[PDB]
Amino acid sequence: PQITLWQRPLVTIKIGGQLKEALLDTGADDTVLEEMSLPGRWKPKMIGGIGGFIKVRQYDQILIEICGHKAIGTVLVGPTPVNIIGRNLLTQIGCTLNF
Amino acid sequence: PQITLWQRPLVTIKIGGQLKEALLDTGADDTVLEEMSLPGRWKPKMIGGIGGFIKVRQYDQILIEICGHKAIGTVLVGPTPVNIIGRNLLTQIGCTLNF
Numbered sequence: 089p090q091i092t093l094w095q096r097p098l099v100t101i102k103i104g105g106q107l108k109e110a111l112l113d114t115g116a117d118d119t120v121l122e123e124m125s126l127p128g129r130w131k132p133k134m135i136g137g138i139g140g141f142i143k144v145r146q147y148d149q150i151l152i153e154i155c156g157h158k159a160i161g162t163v164l165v166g167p168t169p170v171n172i173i174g175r176n177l178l179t180q181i182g183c184t185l186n187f
Numbered sequence: 188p189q190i191t192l193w194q195r196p197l198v199t200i201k202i203g204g205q206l207k208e209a210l211l212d213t214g215a216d217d218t219v220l221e222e223m224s225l226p227g228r229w230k231p232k233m234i235g236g237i238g239g240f241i242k243v244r245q246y247d248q249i250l251i252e253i254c255g256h257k258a259i260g261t262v263l264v265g266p267t268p269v270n271i272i273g274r275n276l277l278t279q280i281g282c283t284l285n286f
């Protein structure tokens with residue numbers, strides 16, 4: 089589909105059998121979701137945004153469906169203000185910017 | 188053009204007669220550039236992202252050229268780690284997300 093940007097590019101994602109709303113963010117290198125429970129072991133990671141850095145938990149090879157498109161990749165979990173689908177997963181679903 | 192997301196979507200912008208590198212950021216509501224001098228009056232504003240909020244100066248009716256495309260809109264100036272072209276200007280150049 090083609091998504092305009094007059095409003096936030098929010099889409100529904102499915103992870104851990106649950107539906108959540110997330111933002112398609114080309115400005116995010118990685119994907120970070122609000123505090124939640126994921127399986128497996130996690131590794132520590134620091135991600136910096138416009139206001140500074142936050143510590144997040146890194147989970148690898150996580151199944152996540154974005155707008156019906158299945159992706160399997162690294163998902164970060166931490167005190168993010170909103171669920172963010174970053175470039176690591178945007179590339180998996182073949183998302184591009186056009187103008 | 189069509190921009191893939193394997194790497195950060197950085198483009199050259201022209202503003203205030205200066206050429207700068209900026210990120211096409213669909214996750215950013217507004218456009219914020221690193222400290223610089225702009226004409227006209229400004230209003231203080233607080234913007235929040237990952238890590239928290241930063242104080243920026245809000246300038247309105249600013250003309251910017253993004254990849255040859257002229258756009259007009261509000262531009263925020265402050266301690267942002269990277270120049271960000273947000274939705275307020277991305278819409279003006281007809282930028283969309285496609286997959």
Ligand SMILES: O=C(N[C@H]1c2ccccc2C[C@H]1O)[C@H](OCc1cccc(F)c1F)[C@H](O)[C@@H](O)[C@@H](OCc1cccc(F)c1F)C(=O)N[C@H]1c2ccccc2C[C@H]1O
Binds near residue numbers: 237
């Ligand atoms: O932090 C980023 N990437 C980082 C990231 C994100 C997730 C995972 C990994 C990494 C690493 C890096 O790429 C991106 O910034 C460019 C950026 C790029 C590289 C290094 C940086 F330092 C950096 F700032 C990101 O797209 C932010 O722009 C955006 O985050 C999602 C978000 C959305 C809505 C409300 C929020 F509160 C919020 F957070 C955000 O903060 N949006 C806010 C914003 C921005 C400009 C003007 C106004 C407003 C208000 C709101 O829309």
